[PDB]
């Protein structure tokens, strides 16, 4: 009763070496678990360039060409899921 993403990530063109963000703000009951996937695979933390900040913001520094793709916010709850994705083009 039950997860809504109120702000999700936004489609972007980003420059190589730059820094960009994936934001996700979710409500629900109970509090939803948030996870991020890129082209269907769960995003790394082992990558020093990719950091979890506060207020829903996942931040990616030193953009590479291979960061291009689809990034999905999945908000979960034993009773439901929501998803909100964006396409990031690094060039």
């Amino acid at each position, epitope marked *: 009763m039950g997860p809504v993403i109120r702000q999700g990530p936004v489609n972007q063109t980003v420059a190589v*070496d*730059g*820094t960009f963000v994936l934001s996700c703000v979710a409500t629900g009951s109970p509090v939803p678990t948030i996870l991020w996937r890129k082209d269907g695979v769960l995003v790394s933390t082992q990558d020093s360039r990719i950091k979890q*900040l*506060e*207020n829903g*913001v996942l*931040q990616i*520094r030193y953009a590479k060409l291979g960061d291009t793709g689809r990034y999905t916010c999945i908000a979960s709850t034993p009773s439901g899921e929501a998803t909100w994705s964006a396409y990031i083009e690094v060039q």
Partner: antibody
Amino acid sequence: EVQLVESGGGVVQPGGSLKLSCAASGFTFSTYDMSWVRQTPDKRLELVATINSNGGSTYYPDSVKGRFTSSRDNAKNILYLQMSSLKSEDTAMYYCAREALLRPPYYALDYWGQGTSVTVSS
Amino acid sequence: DIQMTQSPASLSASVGETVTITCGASENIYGALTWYQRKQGKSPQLLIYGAINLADDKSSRFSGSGSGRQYSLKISSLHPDDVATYYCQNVLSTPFTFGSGTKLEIKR
């Protein structure tokens, strides 16, 4: 104590080239990302170069991309900024700064040098 | 590019006053903001990061607030040594643009 010492500033002709240095000491330099920030005469500030601990990753904003290149020597503990095709807008004070490690890991600069002045002129 | 606009350009208050400096972003930056203090003859120092986290090594007189596009640095119980130029910086996405500064002066 952390010490960051800029040198290499001075006058340079429009279209000319300069290399700045930053002699770092009192912290484990090879282990920290490093930035160069400049302060123009109106007192505005602008980040113009970041470089990671190992030197493998570098960033430059649009204003100086192509024209500015950063490097570091992790044995001697010196940071560099090579500048070229200089113009009046690059006329500024140039600071070398250490990137903090924070929790959460926001980007921030926790120690800065005193600066070296670059004047673009004939 | 995100445009930071800072306010006021300059400001003065008396010892013991509480003062507020503001930073407006051109879009939501989700607390991904930092504040710096620069004293005459010194290098800048970090005061606040992430909009609200005071740096390990500064005074609890400093406090940072806000969300969305609008942010505040509060300096309670002003001291003479607070005299400085204050800067905000966007650190959400590049270019990491700074605010243009607030010079704080003391009335005596």
